[PDB]
Amino acid sequence: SHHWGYGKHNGPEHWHKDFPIAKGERQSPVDIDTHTAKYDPSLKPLSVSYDQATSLRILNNGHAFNVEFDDSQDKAVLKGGPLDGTYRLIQFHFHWGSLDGQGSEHTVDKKKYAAELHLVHWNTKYGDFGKAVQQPDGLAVLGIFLKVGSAKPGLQKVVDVLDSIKTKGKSADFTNFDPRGLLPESLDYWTYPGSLTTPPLLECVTWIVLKEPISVSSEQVLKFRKLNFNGEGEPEELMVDNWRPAQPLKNRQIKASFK
Numbered sequence: 001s002h003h004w005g006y007g008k009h010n011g012p013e014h015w016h017k018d019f020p021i022a023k024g025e026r027q028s029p030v031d032i033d034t035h036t037a038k039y040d041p042s043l044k045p046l047s048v049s050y051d052q053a054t055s056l057r058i059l060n061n062g063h064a065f066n067v068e069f070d071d072s073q074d075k076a077v078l079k080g081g082p083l084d085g086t087y088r089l090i091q092f093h094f095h096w097g098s099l100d101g102q103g104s105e106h107t108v109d110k111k112k113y114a115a116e117l118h119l120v121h122w123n124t125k126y127g128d129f130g131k132a133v134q135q136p137d138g139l140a141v142l143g144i145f146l147k148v149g150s151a152k153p154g155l156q157k158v159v160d161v162l163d164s165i166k167t168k169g170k171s172a173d174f175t176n177f178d179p180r181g182l183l184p185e186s187l188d189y190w191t192y193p194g195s196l197t198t199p200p201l202l203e204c205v206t207w208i209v210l211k212e213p214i215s216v217s218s219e220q221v222l223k224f225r226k227l228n229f230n231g232e233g234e235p236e237e238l239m240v241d242n243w244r245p246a247q248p249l250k251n252r253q254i255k256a257s258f259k
């Protein structure tokens, strides 16, 4: 069993030893250089259809927390933009910092945001998530940057349950949460082919990164930083800086949906 994390001893610079694809040709995240990304007038409109989303549970996995959805049918899907076909929402999670100046995985002209939200979807033509991650077009991850300013009301239900899942392996019922409340106003985006940003680092993701960040309050993000990487009763290691830094772009082009 693997023992990866974000510390000096088991962090991103170590991952390549168990997961050699870490040094691959389409690794994520990347820096988005806004003056090199090209507007692509042929990107179709992005369609976020979350009306029938069914959230189930929230889990501290020792790396982040995941809000899990019922993906047994087409209840919450992402279509359009660069995507062919239908991608089903399976979960969302975040990456964040110890301080507001770092936390995001993607960067924008080298700017790091305080946090990044990842809504993870799988291509329904592959039948299940485990089959989808074996395909170059198996996943679509919608990435949303968080900056610290005004509170995000649609996030507070998440923040308030975190006290009940402080430590690794803890979960809580998390029904009737509406992920539409985490979106910015604009769906303008950048897109590029990449990977999972955690082990196993599989090169199966179409990344769609929204240009407009959402604002969250310092109180909201401070509560993210009170979670623990450790399990119950173990010495406290605060769950902070659970982000992978930018990876080489290699032979890839980042496309913009907007001028």
Ligand SMILES: Nc1nc(Cl)nc2c1ncn2[C@@H]1O[C@H](COS(N)(=O)=O)[C@@H](O)[C@H]1O
Binding pocket: 066, 091, 093, 118, 120, 129, 130, 133, 141, 195, 196, 197, 198, 199, 200
């Ligand atoms: N052992 C594993 N096998 C497979 Cl098959 N998938 C896995 C995985 N461990 C994590 N995942 C997924 O990868 C996302 C992280 O990557 S991210 N930041 O969204 O790019 C996580 O939340 C999960 O969905």
Ligand code: NA
Binding pocket: 183, 184, 185, 212, 213, 214, 215
């Ligand atoms: Na916003």
Ligand SMILES: [Zn+2]
Binding pocket: 093, 094, 095, 118, 197
């Ligand atoms: Zn992620």
